[PDB]
Write a protein that binds this DNA or RNA. Structure first.
Ligand SMILES: [K+]
Ligand SMILES: [K+]
Ligand SMILES: [K+]
Ligand SMILES: [K+]
Ligand SMILES: [Mg+2]
Ligand SMILES: [Mg+2]
Ligand SMILES: [Mg+2]
Ligand SMILES: [Mg+2]
Ligand SMILES: [Mg+2]
Ligand SMILES: [Mg+2]
Ligand SMILES: [Mg+2]
Ligand SMILES: [Mg+2]
Ligand SMILES: [Mg+2]
Ligand SMILES: [Mg+2]
Ligand SMILES: [Mg+2]
Ligand SMILES: [Mg+2]
Ligand SMILES: [Mg+2]
Ligand SMILES: [Mg+2]
Lengths: 108, 148, 74, 48, 195, 56, 39
RNA sequence: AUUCUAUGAUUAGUGUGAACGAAAAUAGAGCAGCCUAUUAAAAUAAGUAAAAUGGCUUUAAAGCUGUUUGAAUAUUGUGGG
RNA sequence: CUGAAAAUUUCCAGUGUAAAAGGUAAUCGAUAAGAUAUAAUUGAAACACCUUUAUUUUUCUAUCGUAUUAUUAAACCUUAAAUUAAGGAACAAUUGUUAGAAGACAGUUUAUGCGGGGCACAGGCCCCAUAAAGAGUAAAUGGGUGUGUCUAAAA
RNA sequence: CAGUCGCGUAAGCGGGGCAUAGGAUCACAAGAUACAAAAAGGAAAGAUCUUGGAUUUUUGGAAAAGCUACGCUAGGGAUAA
């Protein structure tokens, strides 16, 4: 509750731990219907799950897995290897023609 | 005594850039009555390039005739269209020039990729105004209009 | 330049109360060195500290802080 | 100081390499070696 | 050449949108035509200033109307301008044929179409002022008023010219003093060579 | 053209689809010889062309 | 987790989440079944 | 909730090594919750949380701390983990 | 190279102190003349005017840095129940950080081998003999100027 | 054995050199593998494979100078006068 005179939120009279002790104690005696609204209620925990479901990063509803780095760069990796082999015959012809001594194109 | 290896690059945070249509409205007024066949636009594109690096000496065949361009000192100057050019024709006439550059840059080495900093636009008797990537006028009342 | 520099203080916010010359007019908010306010202005009642509580009574907000006007004249 | 260890990079861009030694006052090494990733003989060039 | 250098040189030249000759012409007008000589003689200075001072201010607020100029070498040519005021109650006629500017009189005043009625305005040995007012009162148009920011633009650049002229003479006084002093040094060397 | 243009993506692992490296290597030609080292032409063909250019 | 979901999301293991797939969809949350043809 | 005993555990982990060494959880002993505290206390917490730096502790987090600096306002998703 | 106003760019020739390139043929001259420019000349390159850049130099601003000078005009410090006193003074002093620096002080190492130990010297590996017709085989035993290399195969 | 290259008519030869003298791990650095990812999606830091930089020369691998006649303790005829 936000105090009107002072703009500061007052903690609830019963912490989240104590809220669960009453719900667990009120449910064993069939008096859970009398307790006010609480995020610890058995029906509130279940309604929130069925309504929205899992919302964690990636595997949540509407979320998409990001994939590992070696998975994101898989196609671009195999496309580079494929490009080099296709140009392999033309590279050996220029190498065997120019020769091992006069070759000047080297990786960096 | 001191020396630098770069061309002076000013801060653009406070620059006042104009859209292509808003700019021609200012330029077409200063060239009122001038022979449109003897008045042509021009573009100076400043490049963040090093002095030691090479220069650009390629050519470009624009869609509409107004071509050769050369980088002298961290800038490239060349015409892009006559005064009677409509914004639709003048627009693509610029895109063909920027792409041919960015294509030649990437074609160049990766040691110091020359990136563009600003694009200017002026006429033979008009002021040098900055260009914004936008194309349409900010004023909702005015619309694309072509005339002499 | 660097990603981390020396931590420095920018001053304390104060609201003048006697129209100090060469600094600002009466009821002018700005940041001044803590030395002058703590030793010269506060003892002589020439200004007052602008605490978050003082900002509410005056109705102003933290975005009302001005600047020192060295060219001020009485 | 007289001899150096050079890495011959595969031009297939597979990441395999061979390591040989050669004097400094000589030309870079270039050989036709076997790449176990693609399982074929490709051109291997010195790294630098 | 800083960004603010080019910026101040521009915003000053952007007086096109100002009070002197700017106004929003009505949709009734269709096009304009003018013809005058190159030089300023036999009453030809008026139109020139109207072309370099007030005419550009119209195309900014009226960029749809074509305003063309036809210059010539005949200094005695009739410095007269035509205004196609009537658009046939905005009937939107098909006035496709229309000339373009030139410098040798190659684009004279064409004959108006059926739905067009021109308005002649003579100007010879007359000041641009009397020529300007005759253009607005005749071609009824509302004059746009400047905003406060435009008043600051005029006030700022005005105070700037004070600092500029104050420096134009200052730096001028250091160079001539040097060009004078250095001249004394040259004279001294010449005298030394003689001895 | 059809051989070097083909792309066979397989189910290697983790439901991933990619082209095996050993297949990428056999696009240039079948194993047994190193492409590029083979003489494209024939020595006899070169001799015939040498005369043609001389006759003309 | 990703691996646990993908395990019970495929029909090869008869996972109780396999009914959430399409006949062409893949169990992996990142990879997809490429398309065959010439284009 | 805290406290004590055992298991977890010659474990995770750290360490060049030698060695050091948790927690969750389980079982038992006790069990008690509250602010109107069975002794009389809050108008819900700012130089605080936190950061850089010098140390402690430690697994790099968390926690403690001298120096110089320095936030936000509740699931209608503000703050810490 | 913080930014602003203004200005400056000389090998010979050249109307003359050509900053460079790009674009242009008119621009200025309140109505009468003429000055600029283009042309032509010179040069490798030719000029007004509108643009965007380059070099250098002033003032302003911004940023640092040192010295100097003042300060009940209540920082701090010293004498002083301790003051509108006197003097020093943005120093000194203290805290944190940083670099240097005294065995002044502290902990520890300074080995082992060896016809006793000290001093000296020695330490992995290779070849021959000693070695007694398989292999192996020791000594501060005899032989070696032993050894931490060389080498991509090319005019 | 598999893979794929050279030479040779062929048979076949080739996993360096006529043979016998070049030190690890850790840490560090460069490539690859797709293993695991401390709530979850990534990542970091790890693991496997290949490779480099050492008088670690007391070379199965400590970062290391002396005096004692002021000397002490535990031991030795395993060792001198
Ligand atoms: K362990
Ligand atoms: K911490
Ligand atoms: K023997
Ligand atoms: K995770
Ligand atoms: Mg300070
Ligand atoms: Mg325990
Ligand atoms: Mg040890
Ligand atoms: Mg609280
Ligand atoms: Mg803290
Ligand atoms: Mg944290
Ligand atoms: Mg905390
Ligand atoms: Mg004094
Ligand atoms: Mg000692
Ligand atoms: Mg024997
Ligand atoms: Mg040893
Ligand atoms: Mg051994
Ligand atoms: Mg003695
Ligand atoms: Mg004995």
């Amino acid at each position: 509750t936000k105090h009107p005179i002072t703009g500061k939120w007052h903690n609830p009279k019963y912490s989240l731990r104590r809220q669960a002790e009453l719900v667990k104690l009120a449910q064993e005696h069939g008096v859970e219907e009398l307790l006010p609204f609480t995020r610890k209620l058995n029906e509130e925990k279940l309604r929130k799950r069925v309504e929205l479901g899992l919302r964690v990063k990636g595997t949540g509803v509407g979320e998409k897995v990001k994939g590992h780095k070696h998975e994101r760069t898989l196609v671009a990796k195999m496309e580079k290897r494929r490009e080099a082999m296709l140009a392999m015959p033309d590279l050996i012809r220029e190498w065997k023609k120019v020769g091992k001594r006069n070759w000047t194109k080297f990786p960096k | 005594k001191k020396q630098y290896k770069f061309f002076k690059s000013w801060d653009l945070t406070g620059q006042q850039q104009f859209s292509l249509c808003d700019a021609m409205r200012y330029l077409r007024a200063v060239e009122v009555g001038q022979p449109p066949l003897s008045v042509k636009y021009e573009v100076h594109v400043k490049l963040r390039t090093k002095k030691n690096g090479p220069v650009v000496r390629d050519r470009v065949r624009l869609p509409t005739p107004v071509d050769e361009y050369r980088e002298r000192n961290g800038v490239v100057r060349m015409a892009v269209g006559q005064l009677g050019f409509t914004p639709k024709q003048l627009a693509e006439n610029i895109r063909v020039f920027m792409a041919k550059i960015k294509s030649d840059i990437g074609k160049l080495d990766d040691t110091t990729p020359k990136m563009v900093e600003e694009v200017v636009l002026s006429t033979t008797h008009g002021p040098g105004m900055s260009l914004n990537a936008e194309f349409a006028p900010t004023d909702d009342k005015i619309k694309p209009e072509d005339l002499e | 330049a660097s990603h981390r520099m020396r931590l420095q203080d920018q001053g304390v916010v104060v609201r003048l109360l006697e129209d100090i010359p060469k600094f600002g007019r009466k009821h002018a908010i700005f940041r001044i060195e803590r030395g002058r306010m703590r030793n010269e202005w506060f003892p002589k009642n020439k200004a007052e500290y602008m605490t978050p509580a003082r900002f509410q009574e005056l109705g102003l907000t933290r975005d009302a802080i001005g600047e020192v006007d060295r060219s001020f004249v009485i | 100081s007289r001899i150096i260890n050079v890495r011959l990079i595969s031009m297939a861009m597979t990441g395999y390499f061979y390591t040989f030694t050669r004097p400094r006052t000589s030309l870079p090494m270039s050989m036709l070696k076997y790449d176990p990733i693609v399982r074929r003989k490709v051109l291997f060039l010195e790294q630098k | 050449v800083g960004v603010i250098r080019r910026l101040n040189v521009v915003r000053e030249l952007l007086n096109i949108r100002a009070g002197p000759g700017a106004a929003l012409l009505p949709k009734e007008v269709t096009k304009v035509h003018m013809q005058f000589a190159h030089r300023i003689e036999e009453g030809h200075m008026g139109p020139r200033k109207f072309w370099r001072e007030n005419l550009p201010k119209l195309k900014y607020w009226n960029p749809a109307v074509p305003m063309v100029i036809n210059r010539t070498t005949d200094q005695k040519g009739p410095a007269v301008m035509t205004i196609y005021f009537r658009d046939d109650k905005d009937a939107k006629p098909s006035s496709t044929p229309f000339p373009t500017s030139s410098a040798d009189g190659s684009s004279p005043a064409p004959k108006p179409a059926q739905g067009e009625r021109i308005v002649t305005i003579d100007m010879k040995n007359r000041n641009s002022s009397v020529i300007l007012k005759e253009f607005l009162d005749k071609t009824g148009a509302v004059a746009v008023q400047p905003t406060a920011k435009d008043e600051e633009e005029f006030r700022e650049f005005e105070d700037l010219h004070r600092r500029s002229e104050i420096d134009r003479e200052r730096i001028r006084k250091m160079n001539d003093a040097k060009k004078r002093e250095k001249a004394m040094l040259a004279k001294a060397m010449s005298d030394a060579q003689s001895i | 053209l059809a051989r070097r243009g083909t792309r066979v993506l397989r189910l290697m692992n983790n439901y991933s689809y990619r082209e095996t490296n050993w297949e990428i290597g056999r696009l240039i030609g079948d194993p047994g010889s190193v492409p590029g080292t083979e003489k494209v032409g024939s020595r006899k063909a070169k001799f015939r062309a040498r005369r043609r250019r001389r006759n003309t | 987790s990703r691996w646990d979901i993908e395990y019970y999301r495929d029909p090869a293991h008869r996972g109780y989440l396999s009914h959430q797939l399409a006949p062409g969809e893949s169990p992996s949350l990142y990879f997809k079944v490429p398309t065959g043809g010439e284009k």
